[PDB]
Design a binder for this molecule. Structure first.
Ligand code: ADP
Ligand code: ZN
Ligand code: ZN
Ligand code: ZN
Ligand code: ZN
Ligand code: ZN
Length: 213
């Protein structure tokens, strides 16, 4: 397929098929990769980078998919900056929405807790990353650190896990009594019913599955 990117040479550009009417410059033997976020082509310099750290990262270190943001800046509605070190990743203004178990009731409790204390999702993440680095908090992508260069989706995934642990460590006395009065749901954090308003309000879902007595 013919591909013209931001950094392609003019002669390539003018040789593409015309429309229908009613510092880097790409080398010939080079290739392009499509940004996973904006779908636009960029020169694929990953191999080059493996032996030359001066080239900007072009992929998430977790999912290994290509993203163009660090390389030359990505632009798309919905893109907040799709590749960054975890500690600097833009998760978006609504990142607290359903951040706990995809559960709006539980998530709103955390939002209220943070707002009451003048804290941001940013403050929460910074605090969580400290716990992560000491091995107090844990991640499924267990080798991710605050310094890991990752994408929006992978960052969001780990942010949810860190945030759950953050919430877990809030003392009951620091939350409204209406929150702490609710009994634990038998099925815990993975409960399938908590996406339903009534069930979410009735039971606490910041807990683990009940197994034995
Ligand atoms: N319909 C339900 N759905 C989810 N969790 C429930 C339900 N009914 C009770 N639970 C919760 O399950 C947990 C264990 O309750 P249960 O098995 O009845 O033993 P116990 O008699 O010790 O409460 C309790 O926290 C309770 O709040
Ligand atoms: Zn190009
Ligand atoms: Zn990723
Ligand atoms: Zn992009
Ligand atoms: Zn993007
Ligand atoms: Zn439940």
């Amino acid at each position: 397929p013919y591909v013209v990117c931001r950094q392609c040479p003019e002669y390539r550009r003018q040789a593409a098929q015309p429309p229908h009417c009613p510092d880097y410059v790409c080398p010939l033997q080079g290739s392009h990769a499509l940004c996973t976020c904006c779908f636009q082509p960029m020169p694929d310099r990953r191999v080059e980078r493996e032996q030359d750290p001066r080239v900007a990262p072009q992929q998430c270190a977790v999912c290994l998919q290509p993203f163009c943001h660090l390389y030359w800046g990505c632009t798309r509605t919905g893109c907040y900056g799709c590749l960054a070190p975890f500690c600097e990743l833009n998760l978006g203004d609504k990142c607290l929405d359903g951040v706990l178990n995809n559960n709006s009731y539980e998530s709103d409790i955390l939002k209220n807790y943070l707002a009451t204390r003048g804290l941001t999702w940013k403050n929460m993440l910074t605090e969580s990353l400290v716990a992560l680095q000491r091995g107090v908090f844990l991640l499924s992508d267990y080798r991710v650190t605050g310094d890991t260069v990752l994408c929006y989706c992978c960052g969001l995934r780990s942010f949810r896990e860190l945030t759950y642990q953050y919430r877990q460590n809030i003392p009951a006395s620091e939350l409204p009594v209406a929150v702490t009065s609710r009994p634990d749901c038998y099925w815990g954090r993975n409960c399938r019913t908590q996406v339903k308003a009534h069930h979410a309000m009735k039971f606490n879902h910041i807990c683990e599955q009940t197994r034995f007595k």
